[PDB]
Design a protein around this ligand. Structure first.
Ligand SMILES: *C/C=C1/C(=C/c2[nH]c(/C=C3[NH+]=C(/C=C4\NC(=O)C(C=C)=C4C)C(C)=C\3CCC(=O)O)c(CCC(=O)O)c2C)NC(=O)[C@H]1C
Ligand SMILES: *C/C=C1/C(=C/c2[nH]c(/C=C3[NH+]=C(/C=C4\NC(=O)C(C=C)=C4C)C(C)=C\3CCC(=O)O)c(CCC(=O)O)c2C)NC(=O)[C@H]1C
Lengths: 319, 319
């Protein structure tokens, strides 16, 4: 049961310290990570309402020009499909995805979700050969199914995610009822110090983060030294209030957690929730030594693997 | 516990009737469906040993020319990857998949699996826009997870598979302990007669088919009037014995079952096993009124959906 959040910094909220960090409003940082661009749009008319300041880098046109234009004009070939896929009242985790062409190498991957009356559109560069078929997940299911017990399932899950992603470290981090955690399996690059069997205080993943991670099952920091890029305007004009970004992987990471990652020598981090009977059971927690953008198709594969693993854990815990 | 099979027709076995059909060797028909091509190759040297008679249609070169050539020569860009993906002793259900270019429209999809010392290579045409992302499955998982009980899960599963495939009819067919079956959910085109709630004798899916369907989880008939195309030579030269084709979706369907489908007015059929605690629990059973080749990526998506559904059933039955 998390504490209520304080206002974010851009609304005069307090600075976050180790004394108050359970109240950081991590879902509304009003900014994104710089490896992609974000727009928000009215859910009915498709009018573009907010834009990340870096949008020209990815979209080819300046934020000041794009604002107020409709998606019906900007994305004539996707707007109907997008509307149909995300009707009013749909779950905020439901996503529409499409691949767009862009004057640069590879393509742009577009991911969209709906929060209330707002559509949130994420654009990130993707290379052609950076596709992952349904086979990745399909082939992986076999070894997960043959695991004879919970610990063996955990060991195969971390090895499989490391093989699929190439991350330097992949852990299964299990929560105890007091919200402390333990690394119960780990696949890692030879020579990296082991976190296997190590336990960590509840404060390392505070209660509002655990709540968020029960609703939105994947999040990441692509570069633990990269500065966030503001949304402009920072408030959603529909509401004159902050834009919820929990459902966007481009959401800026809490600075407190960015410092934690840097202190561990981590250049890139990603985790996927394992949710069992509606409760946060654990995380598939991944590190890389250097910045790294896991491709959208692979992130989606990892999400599905998380759901599979949650069901396999739920089956085994009943036994 | 199925009866032992008789020899196949091409080894002088008996004709199959309603009196002996539990002994039809359905896994070794020595032939494939005509919408793709099949080769078999030695698992170590990659020498091509058998070829479907129609291979020139898909590969551009005549069967008589391709035989005896090595995959190292024929597929220089895939042979190393293929070898690495399917090492000796790997599960016969494990697959390697790749998309090849071919002088015709779209591409060729290549699917490979290993049985003993043999590699079995299936080639089928696929269109560019016939790709299905990991998102299809990922988005589908939500409604399956929210289903409040087993029957509701069944209803959402059939509707979801019908939405993903466009099939005229999608059923969940559940086996009873006496191997009879019941259609426990059904999504169908308006106006088609309902099979919902109908029960069927065990003989409609005989014991050797149920055994096969416990190991190889997807099979189909793309055109219920299409004649099978022989493999040549029909016997695997490694063994001087029939080539097991259970793991190839291009395997020719039992003529008995083809007639059953025609009697039902079905033009195309596909099913996916639901396997719970290693036992065949049921099938996701699909019909179309006319011939139809579900694309490889969508078939793989359906496989994964079957595994997901099996785990969700297993979770709910425990409760
Ligand atoms: C006073 C505030 C604190 C704090 C805040 C915080 N932590 C997170 C998110 C995560 N913390 C994680 C912790 C671990 N990663 C590890 O590798 C290990 C052990 C080896 C642990 C215990 C993880 C996995 C996350 C999830 C994010 C990710 O996978 O990178 C947040 C939320 C970040 C966000 O989503 O914006 C916050 C606010 N952590 C602290 O220790 C104290 C100082
Ligand atoms: C004497 C032999 C018989 C026989 C053989 C047979 N049947 C199958 C495979 C299937 N039969 C299925 C039956 C149903 N489909 C339906 O729509 C309904 C009810 C509405 C039923 C009861 C199904 C679903 C299959 C699986 C294949 C598929 O999905 O199309 C085989 C094996 C075919 C193969 O894989 O080569 C065989 C040998 N069926 C008979 O009724 C008797 C005459």
């Amino acid at each position: 049961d998390p504490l209520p959040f304080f206002p974010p910094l851009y609304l005069g909220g307090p600075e976050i310290t180790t004394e108050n960090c359970e109240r950081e409003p991590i879902h509304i940082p009003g900014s994104i990570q710089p490896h992609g661009a974000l727009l928000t749009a009215d859910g009915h008319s498709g009018e573009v309402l907010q834009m990340s300041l870096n949008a020209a880098t990815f979209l080819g046109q300046e934020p000041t020009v794009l604002r107020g234009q409709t998606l019906a004009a900007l994305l004539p070939e996707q707007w109907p499909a997008l509307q149909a896929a995300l009707p009013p009242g749909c779950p905020d985790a439901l996503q529409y995805r499409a691949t767009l062409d862009w004057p640069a190498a590879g393509h742009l991957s577009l991911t969209v979700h709906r929060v209330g009356e707002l559509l949130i559109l994420e654009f990130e560069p993707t290379e052609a050969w950076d596709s992952t078929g349904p086979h990745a997940l399909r082939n992986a299911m076999f070894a997960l199914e043959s695991a004879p017990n919970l610990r063996a399932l955990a060991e195969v899950a971390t090895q499989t995610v490391r093989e699929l992603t190439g991350f330097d470290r992949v852990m299964l981090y299990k929560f105890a009822p007091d919200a402390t955690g333990e690394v119960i399996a780990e696949a890692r690059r030879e020579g990296l110090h082991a976190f296997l069997g190590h336990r960590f205080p509840a404060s390392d993943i505070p209660a509002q983060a655990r709540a968020l991670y029960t609703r939105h099952l994947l999040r990441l920091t692509a570069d633990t030294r990269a500065a966030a890029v503001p949304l402009d305007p920072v408030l959603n004009p529909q509401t004159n209030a902050p834009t919820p970004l929990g459902g966007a992987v481009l959401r800026a990471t809490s600075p407190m957690h960015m410092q934690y990652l840097r202190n561990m020598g981590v250049g890139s981090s990603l985790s996927v929730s394992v949710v069992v009977g509606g409760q946060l059971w654990g995380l598939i927690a991944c590190h890389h030594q250097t910045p790294y953008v896991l491709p959208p198709d692979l992130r989606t594969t990892l999400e599905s693997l998380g759901r599979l693993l949650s069901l396999q854990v739920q089956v085994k815990e009943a036994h």
